[PDB]
Each structure stands twice: as C-alpha cells, then as structure tokens.
Symmetry: C3
Subunit: 222 residues, 3 copies
C-alpha cells in the first residue's frame, strides 16, 4: 500500500538486476552472514532465553501440541527424518494433558536434508490455515520410517486432508527463525527441548522427562 | 518507470543494505534454492519434457546449428570443457548436413567450472547480436584442448572476429535457464542430447547416433 | 527524499520476498560473482596498480598512519591474525617516523578467517567516527598473539576507549573493496605492501625496507 503495483514490480526487477550487475554486493553479504553466525555462536546462553522469550514462546507461526493457554510450555526442536526425534515426540505428546497445564511448541529444523526443510515448510504452512490439522500430519511425518521425499510427503499431506494447502514462502521465514534460534541457543543436536531456562539435548526416558516437567511446575507461582 | 532515477537510485542502495543489515535473508534463499533444485531434480522427465517444450525449442537466445525451419530438432546440453563434448559436437554437426531435416540447438552448461560459464556467456552473447559468428566461436571454444581462461577465450574471439562483442548479463539469464532445465530433465552428465521423446546421455559412436536420428526422422515422415 | 519511510520498508520486504519466491535470481548472481572474481585474478599486476590508483591512495575510508602531507605513501594489506603482519606492522610505523615524507595506508584483509573480518570491521568503524583513536586499537589488535574472538576484539576496544563505537555495515563495503583489490593485485600472502609501482609481499628486515623506500623517494 506504500508502493503501487507498477512501482512494486519494478522494484522486484531491480533486485534481480542489481545483484547480477553488481556481484560485489553479494560477497559482502556472504562475509556479513558468516560474521553474524559467529556473533550468535559466541553469545551468552541464559541471556538468550531472556531475550528470545518472545520468539520461543510467543510465535504465532510456531505449531503447538496441547492447550493454547497453559502455564508451562515446552519447545521441541525437531527434524522429521531424525530417528531420535521420532523416538521422543511421542514422549512429548503424552506429557501434554496427562499434565494439562503443559503444552509443547514445535520448532521444525532442516538439518538432515532438503526434505527436512520441505517437511517443515509443509507443517508451518498448515499451522496458519488450520491449526488443528497440523497434528495428524506432524505424527505421520514423524512416524513415517525413512528419509521422506516430495513423493513420500505428498502421501503424508494426503492422509491428513492437507493437500489443498500450498507451501508458502512466508512459512520459510519461520523455519529460518527456528534455525537462527538453534544457533542462538547453541543447539546443533536434535531433538532438543527447552523446558524453562534449560535445554534438553537428546532422547530422555519418559520417567525422567516426567520428573523434569514437574520440577518446572514447582517453579511457577501457586 | 513507474520510478524516477532518484527512486531507482535508492532501490539499488536498499538491496545492498537489506542483505547486509539482515544477512539471514541470504541463507534463507540458499536453502530455498537447494529446495527448488530438488523439486526440479525430482520432477518427472516426461512432464518436464512436455512443459519445457517452448523453453527447449523456442528460445531465441539458444544458438542453432542447422536449418531454421526443420521438423526434427535436437537439443544438446553441452559444456566447452567436457572432453566428451568436444568429440561429440562434431558428430552432431555431421548429422545437420547429412540430414538437412535435422538441426541442433546448443544448450551450454557451466558444470565443469567458471570458464565454462564464461565461455557459455560469450557464445550466447554473440548469438544474440550476430548469430552467424557463433559457430566459428563455438568450434574454437569447443575444439580447444586443455582448460579455458579469459585469455584463451579472448584469443578465439577476433580470431572469429567477435571481441567487439560485449558479454552481457542477460546471457547469464539464458545460461541459468539452461541450468534449471538440465535438472528438470534429470541430467547428471555432459553431453546430453534431447532426441524426440527421450534423452541420449553421453558420447556416442557416429553410426550409433546416425540410426537413432533417422529413427526419429521416421516418426515425423512427411 | 526519494522514497518515504513506509516505502523504504516495503522495498526491504520485496527484496527479501522476491529472492525467496524466485531463488534462481540468487544462483545466477552466484556465478556472476565467481566469474567476476576470476576476472580480477586474471588481471595484469601492474596495470591493476595503474587503474585503481583512486582506490588505493584516495579512499577516505582507508586508515592512514603518518602525515596527511607525505610525498611517498605505502599501502599495506594486512591481517590482524597474521603473525608476519604483526612482525611487519611495527616496521611500518618506523619509516613514517623516520621519514615524515612517507605515510602508510592500512588495507585490512579477512584472509585468515571471520575473526579477521570482524576485527577489520571494528578498526575501520573507529576511523570513521574517531580517527584519533584508531592507532591505539590498530596496535593492540596487532600485538595480540593467537586468534581473536568476539571477546578479544571487544576487550581491545575497552583498553583504547573505543567500545562505544558501533561496527557499521558501511565498513564492509570497504572491507569488500580491499578484498576485490587484493585479488586484482594478485595477493596470496600477507603482508603485502604497495610501494609506488611494485608490491613487496612479506615481513622484511628493516634495513631492507629502508633502502627500498628511500630508493623510491629518489624516484619521486
């Protein structure tokens, strides 16, 4: 609404024209990227959670398994082709409303491949249009053994009534927010679950996960 | 325009600032492309052959060896640094005169290095301004034993009377189209030749190639 | 007054949006850079000195150690993580102190890593806001044994009163200019020093460097 369609499309042509005509802009943006990675990589961890509370716990684009109004919320960084995530996600859903004032926030990651980014792109695109339709797709993207492809996924989005949903480019923005966050939180292992100022890197026994979520509910008010 | 030079002047400045101030935009586009590569890589070669018919056969930026109006048209994805292409390219030119109803469209590829991109950038730039000078340059770049540099390329140019010719950035657009089409068609080797309804991957003995294309001249008779 | 603030942000959204919806714009721009890089590597060394004299000697963004009034100007491509530059940089302040008609322009390079690029970005940012404080930071980053970190750089700024200065993105253009310039000049070792029409690559004994710069003070 700031720019008109005629203005808006000329700008889109200029982006292409400028980067190719002046490639020096690109290498500058490359070194600037490799630098910002280091700025986040060599940061202080706890103060990341105090400064990243709004992106972790208050992202409207981040899928949630459980109640939207809960006192304790877990954040699970996951990959749909990672065997350990497939082994832990069920443990994360069972704690949801066996312990009802606890919910789980999903942060999909593109670590193990292109399908990981692709599967994430599907899951995030679904979350905005029909949030309740997320779960069925989420479980089968997880419970499907082997590295999914666009073909394996076209079967998955179809066993969940989510095939009319288009993978948006804006859903890719969120996947990135999750990716920068893993670095800011210093996570290069998945699964990773944030449960209140602390991170859980790896698969943990249910009865231990059980104790942890209870200890963090003691950490809250009355 | 739509935009005035001053506005146009700011847009070129903002793209630099945007990419440098927010470098994460870049890595987002990096995986988005690795994603897009795979979507083209995992495309169906038939519906790739069917949907890329105008891109293969009706690109004015793609050089043609043979008759302008021919019914059988071969599309050769080539690289000027490929040892096999140098020995296969003459064989494709022999068919264009033994069989006047056959033409060959050159689809240069930048697989084997940066010089390949530069050499491709040259022939495509020449073809757009003066098509008649292309073949001489094409052959001198191709039939050149050993790797290419800007000097070896520049030696082949006025030695074909063509260094007055500018290497345009729009020729990169065509090289790029050649690059994406190669992925949609499932091409993991140069040379690669489109021969009707299937692709011929590799350097082939002439008499093997001969039977193949007359077999393709039988399917259009007239 | 070309674009309004609302327009300036939509343009920022469109550049972001356009590159992601059409990632192919990027890949075309990737090999335009890889091509441009090779074009610089395959330049003739001397005609690179002749064609970018304006970039070497007349960049207001390039720090200078010595007199604004000098007849001879040295251009030293250096790295704050290169041990040879740490042994050569002190020798460069002596000639500017031995010979007041000689000056030194610093051309930082991010060759040995990301730490090199950040450290350069810190030093260049100071030069733009507080030129007088540059030398102190420059010297303290140099005499630092071992590689630098985000902490090590920031500590050297606190030890020189330059921590209040922000690392600008405008310094990356300069950092980038030095990198393309290093390629055109065919520099694959630091230190590298432009001394009129020749480059002297490496840490050299003072008495060798002295004879050279006096000999070129004879040619001017």
């Amino acid at each position: 609404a700031a720019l008109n369609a005629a203005q808006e499309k000329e700008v889109r042509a200029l982006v292409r024209d400028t980067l190719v005509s002046n490639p020096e802009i690109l290498e500058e943006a490359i070194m600037a990227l490799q630098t910002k990675k280091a700025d986040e990589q060599q940061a202080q961890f706890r103060q990341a959670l105090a400064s990243e509370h709004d992106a972790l716990y208050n992202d409207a684009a981040s899928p949630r398994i459980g109640a939207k109004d809960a006192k304790l919320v877990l954040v699970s960084f996951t990959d749909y082709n990672c065997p350990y995530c497939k082994r832990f996600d069920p443990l994360l859903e069972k704690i949801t409303e066996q312990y009802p004032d606890v919910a789980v926030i999903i942060k999909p990651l593109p670590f193990k491949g292109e399908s990981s980014a692709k599967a994430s792109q599907a899951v995030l695109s679904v979350w905005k249009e029909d949030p309740k339709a997320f779960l069925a797709l989420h479980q089968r993207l997880m419970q499907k053994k082997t590295m999914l492809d666009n073909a394996s996924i076209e079967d998955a989005m179809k066993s969940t009534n989510t095939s009319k949903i288009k993978l948006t480019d804006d859903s890719l923005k969120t996947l990135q927010n999750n990716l920068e966050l893993s670095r800011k939180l210093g996570i290069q292992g998945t699964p990773a679950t944030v449960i209140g100022d602390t991170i859980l890197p790896g698969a943990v026994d249910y009865d231990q996960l059980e104790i942890i979520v209870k200890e963090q509910l003691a950490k809250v008010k009355k």
